[PDB]
Design an enzyme around this catalytic site. Structure first.
Site, PDB file in Angstrom:
ATOM      1  N   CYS B 152       6.404  -2.915  18.151  1.00 56.68           N
ATOM      2  CA  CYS B 152       6.039  -1.834  17.242  1.00 56.68           C
ATOM      3  C   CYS B 152       5.063  -2.303  16.169  1.00 56.68           C
ATOM      4  O   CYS B 152       4.187  -1.538  15.750  1.00 56.68           O
ATOM      5  CB  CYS B 152       7.289  -1.228  16.607  1.00 56.68           C
ATOM      6  SG  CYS B 152       8.563  -2.397  16.114  1.00 56.68           S
ATOM      7  N   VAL B 156       1.534  -0.477  15.166  1.00 57.18           N
ATOM      8  CA  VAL B 156       1.326   0.145  13.861  1.00 57.18           C
ATOM      9  C   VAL B 156       0.006  -0.318  13.253  1.00 57.18           C
ATOM     10  O   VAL B 156      -0.802   0.496  12.794  1.00 57.18           O
ATOM     11  CB  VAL B 156       2.512  -0.155  12.926  1.00 57.18           C
ATOM     12  CG1 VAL B 156       2.129   0.107  11.476  1.00 57.18           C
ATOM     13  CG2 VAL B 156       3.726   0.660  13.324  1.00 57.18           C
TER      14      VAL B 156
HETATM   15  S1  CLF Z   1      11.221  -8.370  15.629  1.00 57.22           S
HETATM   16 FE1  CLF Z   1      13.352  -7.681  15.167  1.00 57.22          FE
HETATM   17  S2  CLF Z   1      13.980  -6.737  17.127  1.00 57.22           S
HETATM   18 FE2  CLF Z   1      11.707  -6.745  17.172  1.00 57.22          FE
HETATM   19  S3  CLF Z   1      10.921  -4.503  16.468  1.00 57.22           S
HETATM   20 FE3  CLF Z   1      10.974  -6.226  14.814  1.00 57.22          FE
HETATM   21  S4  CLF Z   1      12.982  -5.927  13.709  1.00 57.22           S
HETATM   22 FE4  CLF Z   1      13.123  -5.065  15.827  1.00 57.22          FE
HETATM   23 FE5  CLF Z   1      12.556  -3.070  17.834  1.00 57.22          FE
HETATM   24  S5  CLF Z   1      11.927  -0.804  18.494  1.00 57.22           S
HETATM   25 FE6  CLF Z   1      11.526  -2.214  20.279  1.00 57.22          FE
HETATM   26  S6  CLF Z   1      12.865  -4.014  19.815  1.00 57.22           S
HETATM   27 FE7  CLF Z   1      10.817  -4.447  18.813  1.00 57.22          FE
HETATM   28  S7  CLF Z   1       9.394  -3.067  19.941  1.00 57.22           S
HETATM   29 FE8  CLF Z   1      10.102  -2.492  17.818  1.00 57.22          FE
END
Ligand code: CLF
Ligand SMILES: Nc1ncnc2c1ncn2[C@@H]1O[C@H](COP(=O)(O)OP(=O)(O)O)[C@@H](O)[C@H]1O
Ligand code: ICS
Ligand code: CLF
Ligand code: ALF
Ligand SMILES: [Fe+3]
Ligand SMILES: [Fe+3]
Ligand SMILES: [Mg+2]
Lengths: 478, 522, 274, 522
Positions: B152, B156
């Site tokens: 994500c 972004v």
């Molecule tokens: S490093 Fe950690 S687990 Fe990664 S996003 Fe960031 S806080 Fe979460 Fe989340 S919804 Fe899917 S798993 Fe990511 S691409 Fe985003």
């Protein structure tokens, strides 16, 4: 075998990397030598992962929501952002708790804001406020709300602190904003630090001007024990069996009330130094509460730690500790007499996150098993400093090991047993090496204390001596 | 205390008297929890209809979603190509979570890399991350292709994957001819199935878009099969077996069954099988392209119709009797091969099982959830069996899919009491099975918690869970099952009828109370 | 036909105003043009539509579910002289993430086929502060071919143009996007034209039609129209005609060689004194 | 009373208050039933060790046997041949029972005829019954072969089948060339597996004894496979598939899979598939004969070694890992074909499943029963998995089989607590699981009653039943499963581990009581 060969193995493994990656990774691999006073000259850690090398590390969200905040029973933890992080972290960690899930406990539930594109483009603060209102409407018995930020929240500058303040004032609720966006830091370690800071700033000081709690001189709080497989419980029964009153548990089977009552205790027993040393130091330097590192892995470490903790109290506590030791002596002696002959002389390599790679060595040695390789995903310099006094001579040490590195080390060293996480388990099971999950206890446990030791020895023998490992090669092949 | 002869794990270690006393004392002294009467009252309230109204008025809060994010599906799609490393541009925690998720579902190694974008990479962009990550991954794991998705954070900040990969190629980090297909997979759009669709479209246009000049439809006399997001290895196997029995030339693009089912013979194979690059290059030459799960292959459908010029058939997922029949007849009408006698006999054996089990199946009410194509196929098959799919939930479904499923329900007398919910999570479904109780619920492992909740209202209100879907974490080797084709329908029928029969056996096991109906012969 | 240009430059230097006047001049020559505003301020189509474009891609998408439910006719609207006008939406200042909105809006335009035939020009008016990759969406591969940087004799304007060139370099090497030239908006500075010409030479480009500062532009734009609609026979209208003609017949498309801060200061001492 | 919207069958209709009142009044006023306290005391006594001693001192009484009579196995073996009518000389009630038994197990038609010997036929013999029955059966059902077995009455009175059939042929009731193999199958000797062995030996010697001069071993380059008494269709299928993948020419004698798995396509097929007569005629030309279940194929082994001159290999049933390996290596050493890579990969995938599931399987205690070869294979596989087969019951086992199984147990560390019982019934086994409680029991549907009994002692004493064996009446389509080969081992492993996991989930489903161990990931 031999300090020279393992160094040669390290160089041969590093040979495949590009020069930048090889230069970086050479500083994260070492051969243990107790003639070293500072680990800075020995091995460096807590640095950026090399891209594309298939690291084992998690993110700050994993270290905050998945490790520190999540285990708290009566609080609702909201994975603020898109749907992925909370879904993958939902009940993946066996931080055991007692409660009624969905009514007054929420640990295995996944609360999320489920960010869509319009939430990214126009912001999610209003959605966060509406979510807090809905949480109040549908979960009225919750005793706290934490907002764990994911990556987009940190990117787009959502003012979750303002929402937390306004909604907490409006609802008389503790709403803790945690800026644990995954891209911060290099691993779960900064997640630990951010979660500890959030606890300090929003929870620990709620009962500062409160004296309605009766305090006994034998008040201790367990810090950095997350009740994996009931670990904390198996630990707690020992402490309260030697007279101590366990006011707080951090944070496995933990309640926000226990965290608020932690400043009232007299001693802070830290199990995981890496995750919660921040709050231990804060409480030491603010409330004057001393904190001591202990270890409940295996009979030797358990007895040693129990005597060390008893030495910090009256003679009555010391007599109770001695009677606990004498009472539990036959059980762990029977465990040794049953399982040590099956395990004596077996070599183990470990790779876990930040405390267990060195904490469980005593338990393995209690069964005659030698740890020849160990390493951490996200430990700091002080962790390796503590590790040197526990590892044997000329033993491999690795930091943020890659899949390639760890596979090659296992191929050359050929240990009898590997202890690591779920992302290495099936790789090494397919190589014919018995594997034990050292995070989840392979859905077994506890491993803490004497009952935990019995379970640990049973699991080690069960996996190490399983007949399946003798059937890897088809009989019609050389 | 422990007896060395019989060692208790956490259950039932913590049912011992000393542990129970410790837990009670801890709760009384330091937890300050609500009175048990208050907790019981709140639970009973959560099982009510008013609570369900409040639940379905939710607008901002999601509780226990039945979906994942796009890069998970992108990684699964990339895994189905030969010697292909999944590479997620963005933060490494995402990759750790994807790998752990698939490891727990498949009980197999899952290879995936990240370029480990930190705060500095978030602020400055991950172009250096892309260069070093591509070079390091290629040098370390020697893939024949690196398939790039996004987390994500990279979506972004607008990390231009195309520009980053092109710069990495021009600056000598990776060879210029090394295949690096890419797809933008924003987690805040769609779900994991959307990520699968996006990754497949990127991989397809990487190998086909610029070389369409020398392509003629049908010249290879094969059929393109696109499976979509599939976590049942038996589904790949059954599609392959049914097409090869038919004598039909086929090309299954994104075939991950080998890499997720490697043997344990003292060797770790990072790569195994998968769709070759030559298969994707020759794919435009196929007679046609059949989408196994069309409702999350919309982008792929648009690309295949607009670029390969294939008239993609309007086929539902080949699940259950009627839709397996339609799939086979369409494959016949495309390839020109007739449906062989073995397939006809397999269909007849499915019908025989249906007639053998209809008395126990008929009238049974179900709550089900999952991905849209799987859910729709399950609904259709349940209607074929005389069952009632009363609660049909699809978190990642859309309005058009809901309309199609509503039309399917209207065509059968057993869809009269059925309601289709889209955008609803498993908390909504918990309310639904409390207020309009079905006999069973069909879904992934998360549904187990719903079952737990129902058992707390009483044994008579308990809704047992039948584990079909993704992910399945609390059972072993269910990922080897099949749900497509006549064989998949047979397995699903067996599971359903035997779940019903085991439930009835449990409800009639009480001697002198209910065992008058504890029949040996069912 | 189908020339795709991206208008960049220092903030408030007059990108939207010059772009709209140039588009009016091009449309009066029978050329079919479409203006895409990549600023969360949907103010780059006001002088063409004679009103603020209330309907924007992001706002319509948020109101109507997602961007897929949208239709082009609801966001793509004609204006003066057959100029199609669309605007990427955006949040109010200080909230959300407008770059992601621009990315999504441009992806929606691409997927819906807004780039049809019989369209001679597509002008992406971008905001002055390109803070993320999202606002570089117009200069992605196969999106915009020519880049026009509006500058002036101010030190800040030239520094911003050089910084924008530094940002452009990565996309120019990645794809086929090039720097057409430096449009100059007069700010009435000492040796303005000399400074712009010297900076363009140092970048490896030209200065295309230094545009004088005139209040006829302010009047026309306060009457909700371009100068062409207001006073076709005015001097600035003829200047905008000349700018359009010089844009049509341009072939200097280069990858900029941006100069460091030291070289910029030397340029300022050499041409910014007296 | 009933509500037309929700109609209750016997369960739970007879749980209604009026029905409960009626039953209570009936028992109180007319049944003269023992007091509930007396019944509870007697049940608790039956669960004790002293009761087990009394039980195991039985000499004359058999309670809930785990075996059937010879003609049932004879009928199954006869059914394994093409266009063959099973024909049982004797009384018709036997045929009705055999047909009903197999119908309930397979949920398929089971064709079999009787010559309907009545009291007059008992006194005067069944010569006329044989003549008229052979004529009527051949004219009515048009079989290409009539395979003759016996009920107990015809065996007691010495109805000489050979003489009867010969007189039928010479008197023009049936054509002289019409094949009528016969076998004496005394129900008071051995069990159903003995009937299978006797029937197969009769058929073999009918088609091979006289015409042996023109037979040379190996001239057809095939391998004879004798399955024995087999009620899992997947077992026939897996043996066929493993030999086909291996490139080995084979002849499966008595193949009933087609006739027991006919499709429902609007017509009824009385006969389908089966071992052709030419296959049995050419069987002496085979390279060798492999007995799939040697421990009830002793007479067949004597005939094959002494008449066909085949050196029948000493192979255990191909169950589990080691014995499937041994079977494949012996087939290789006989036919000269190498073991192909697909079989090696299947073996490796089985090993991977074992490594994935060993933590849940290891240390698990089992009570099991069934036929000797199946029981021995299950014991061997359970030892391979690290499980403990503490109770091993074989009603129709013998002393030599017990010796072989004891030697197998002695070779493994997990056979120390194992005891083998022969000649014991399921009442013995219910006592056994009361006094030395295993975690699960594996067996046929009858074991369900034992489970019920255990649940009456309490939930903590309940021994769940895992349904593997014959017959399975209370589940649907389990006869389609496999137990032989790597595929059968995989299915058995999946069933065992998921039975363990479902039991653990049930034992940890109580909220705030045991749900702390209600893990999503297992
Ligand atoms: S490093 Fe950690 S687990 Fe990664 S996003 Fe960031 S806080 Fe979460 Fe989340 S919804 Fe899917 S798993 Fe990511 S691409 Fe985003
Ligand atoms: N040639 C010009 N003559 C007079 N005023 C101008 C001229 N060009 C731009 N402006 C004025 O300068 C101001 C800058 O606004 P704008 O055009 O929106 O800049 P930008 O698009 O770069 O943010 C406008 O009000 C406009 O009227
Ligand atoms: S908190 Fe840490 S990785 Fe100290 S993030 Fe990790 S439940 Fe590990 S080695 Mo999983 S620093 Fe705990 C840990 Fe250790 S999740 Fe558990 S096992 S003792
Ligand atoms: S007509 Fe009736 S069912 Fe037949 S035997 Fe006679 S009483 Fe009995 Fe018995 S053991 Fe088997 S089923 Fe027979 S061959 Fe004998
Ligand atoms: F202020 Al602007 F484009 F509107 F720079
Ligand atoms: Fe049937
Ligand atoms: Fe595995
Ligand atoms: Mg502008």
């Amino acid at each position: 075998m031999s300090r020279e060969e393992v160094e040669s193995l390290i160089q041969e493994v590093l040979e495949v990397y590009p020069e930048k990656a090889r230069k970086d990774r050479n500083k994260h691999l070492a051969v243990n030598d107790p003639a070293v006073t500072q680990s800075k000259k020995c091995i460096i850690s807590n640095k950026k992962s090399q891209p594309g090398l298939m690291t084992i590390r998690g993110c700050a969200y994993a270290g905050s929501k998945g490790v520190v905040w999540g285990p708290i029973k009566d609080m609702i933890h909201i994975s603020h952002g898109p749907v992925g992080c909370g879904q993958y972290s939902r009940a993946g960690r066996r931080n055991y708790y007692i409660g009624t899930t969905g009514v007054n406990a929420f640990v295995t539930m996944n609360f999320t804001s489920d960010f869509q594109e319009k939430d990214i483009v126009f912001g999610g603060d209003k959605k966060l406020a509406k979510l807090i209102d809905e949480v109040e409407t549908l979960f009225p018995l919750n005793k706290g709300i934490s907002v764990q930020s994911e990556c987009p929240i940190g990117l787009i500058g959502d003012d979750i602190e303002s929402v937390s303040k306004v909604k907490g004032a409006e609802l008389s609720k503790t709403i803790v904003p945690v800026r644990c966006e995954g891209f911060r830091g290099v691993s779960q370690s900064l997640g630990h630090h951010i979660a500890n800071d959030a606890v300090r700033d929003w929870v620990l000081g709620k009962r500062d001007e409160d004296t309605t709690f009766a305090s006994t001189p034998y008040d201790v709080a367990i810090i950095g024990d997350y009740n994996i497989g009931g670990d904390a419980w198996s630990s707690r029964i020992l402490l309260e069996e030697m007279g101590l009153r366990c006011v707080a548990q951090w944070s496995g089977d933990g309640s926000i009330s226990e965290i608020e009552l932690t400043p009232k205790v007299k001693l802070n027993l830290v199990h995981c130094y890496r995750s919660m040393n921040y709050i231990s130091r804060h409480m030491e330097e603010k409330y004057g509460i001393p904190w001591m590192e202990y270890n409940f892995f295996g009979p030797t470490k358990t007895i040693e730690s129990l005597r060390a903790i008893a030495a910090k109290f009256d003679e009555s506590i010391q007599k109770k500790c001695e009677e606990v030791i004498a009472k539990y002596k036959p059980e762990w002696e029977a465990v040794v007499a049953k399982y040590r002959p099956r395990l004596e002389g077996k070599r183990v390599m470990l790779y876990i996150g930040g405390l267990r790679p060195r904490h469980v060595i005593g338990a393995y040695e209690d069964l005659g098993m030698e740890v020849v390789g160990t390493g951490y995903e996200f430990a700091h310099n002080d962790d390796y400093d503590r590790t040197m006094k526990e590892m044997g001579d000329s033993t491999l040490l690795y930091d943020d090991v890659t899949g390639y590195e760890f596979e090659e080390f296992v191929k050359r060293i050929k240990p009898d047993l590997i202890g690591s996480g779920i992302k290495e388990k099936f790789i090494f099971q397919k190589m014919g090496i018995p594997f034990r999950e050292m995070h989840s206890w392979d859905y077994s446990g506890p491993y803490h204390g004497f009952d935990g030791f019995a379970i640990f020895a049973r699991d080690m023998d069960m996996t190490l001596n399983n007949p399946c490992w003798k059937k890897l090669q088809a009989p019609w092949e050389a | 205390s422990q007896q060395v002869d019989k060692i208790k794990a956490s259950y039932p270690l913590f049912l011992d008297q000393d542990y129970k006393d410790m837990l009670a004392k801890k709760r009384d002294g330091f937890e300050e929890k609500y009175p048990q009467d208050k907790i019981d009252e709140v639970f009973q309230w959560t099982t009510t209809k008013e609570y369900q109204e409040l639940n379905f008025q939710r607008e901002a809060l999601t509780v226990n979603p039945a979906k994942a994010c796009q890069p998970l599906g992108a990684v699964l799609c990339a895994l189905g190509f030969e010697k292909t490393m999944p590479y997620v541009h963005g933060s490494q925690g995402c990759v750790a979570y994807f790998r752990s998720y698939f490891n727990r579902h498949f009980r197999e190694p899952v290879s995936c890399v990240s370029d480990s974008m930190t705060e500095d990479a978030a602020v400055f962009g991950g172009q250096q991350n892309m260069k070093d990550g591509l070079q390091n991954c290629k040098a370390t794991y020697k893939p024949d292709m690196i398939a790039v998705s996004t987390t994500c954070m990279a979506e972004v900040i607008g990390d231009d994957l195309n520009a980053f990969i092109n710069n990495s190629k021009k600056e000598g980090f990776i060879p210029d001819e090394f295949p690096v297909p890419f797809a933008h997979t924003p987690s805040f759009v769609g779900s994991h199935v959307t990520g699968w669709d996006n990754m497949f479209e990127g991989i397809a246009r990487y190998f086909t878009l610029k070389s369409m000049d020398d392509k003629v439809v049908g010249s290879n006399k094969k059929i393109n099969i696109v499976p979509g997001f599939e976590t049942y290895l038996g589904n790949f196997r059954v599609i392959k077996r049914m097409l090869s029995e038919m004598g039909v030339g086929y090309s299954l693009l994104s075939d991950p069954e080998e890499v997720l089912d490697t043997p344990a013979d003292g060797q770790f194979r990072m790569y195994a099988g998968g769709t070759t690059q030559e298969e994707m290059k020759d794919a435009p030459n196929a007679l046609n392209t059949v989408l196994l799960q069309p409702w999350h292959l919309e982008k792929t459908k648009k690309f295949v119709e607009g670029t390969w010029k294939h008239e993609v058939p309007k086929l539902n997922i080949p699940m259950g009797l009627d839709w397996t029949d339609e799939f086979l007849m369409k494959v016949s009408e495309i390839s020109g091969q007739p449906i062989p006698a073995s397939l006809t006999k397999e269909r007849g054996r499915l019908v025989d099982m249906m007639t053998d089990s209809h008395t126990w199946l008929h009238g049974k009410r179900f709550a089900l959830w999952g991905d849209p194509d799987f859910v729709m196929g399950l609904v259709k098959f349940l209607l074929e069996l005389g069952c009632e799919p009363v609660h049909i939930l699809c978190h990642n479904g859309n309005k058009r899919w809901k309309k199609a499923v509503d039309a399917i329900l209207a065509a059968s007398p057993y869809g009269k009491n059925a309601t289709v919910y889209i955008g609803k999570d498993l908390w909504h479904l918990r309310s639904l099975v409390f207020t309009d109780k079905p006999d069973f619920m069909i879904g992934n492992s998360y549904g187990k918690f719903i079952q737990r909740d129902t058992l707390h209202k009483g044994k008579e209100f308990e809704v047992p869970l039948i584990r079909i879907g993704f992910p399945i974490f609390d059972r072993h080797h269910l990922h080897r099952s099949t749900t497509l084709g006549y064989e998949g329908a047979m397995q699903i029928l067996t599971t359903l009828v035997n779940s019903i029969l085991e439930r009835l056996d449990e409800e009639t096991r009480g001697m002198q109370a209910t065992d008058y109906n504890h029949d040996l012969v069912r | 036909a189908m020339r795709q240009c991206a208008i960049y430059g220092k903030g408030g230097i007059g990108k939207s105003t010059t772009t709209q006047n140039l588009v009016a001049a091009l449309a009066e020559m029978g050329k079919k043009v479409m203006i895409v505003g990549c600023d969360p301020k949907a103010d780059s189509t006001r002088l063409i539509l004679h009103s603020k474009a209330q309907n924007t891609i992001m706002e319509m998408a948020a109101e109507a579910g997602t961007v897929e439910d949208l239709e082009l006719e609801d966001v793509l609207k004609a204006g003066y002289g057959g100029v199609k006008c669309v605007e990427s939406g955006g949040p109010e200042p200080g909230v959300g993430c407008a770059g992601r909105g621009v990315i999504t809006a441009i992806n929606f335009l691409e997927e819906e086929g807004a780039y049809e035939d019989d369209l001679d020009f597509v002008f992406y008016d971008v905001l002055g502060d390109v803070v993320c990759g999202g606002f570089a969406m117009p200069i992605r591969e196969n999106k915009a071919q020519e880049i026009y940087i509006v500058c002036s004799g101010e030190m800040m304007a030239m520094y911003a143009a050089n910084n924008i060139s530094k940002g452009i370099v990565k996309y120019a090497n990645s794809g086929s996007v090039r720097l057409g030239g430096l449009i100059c908006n007069s700010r009435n500075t000492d040796r303005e034209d000399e400074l712009i010409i010297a900076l363009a030479n140092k970048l490896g480009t030209q200065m295309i039609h230094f545009v004088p500062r005139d209040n006829v532009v302010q009047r026309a734009e306060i009457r909700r129209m371009t100068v062409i609609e207001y006073d076709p026979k005015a001097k600035q209208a003829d200047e905008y005609r000349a700018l359009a003609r010089k844009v049509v017949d341009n072939k200097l498309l280069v990858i900029p060689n941006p100069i460091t801060m030291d070289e910029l200061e030397e340029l300022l001492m050499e041409f910014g004194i007296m």
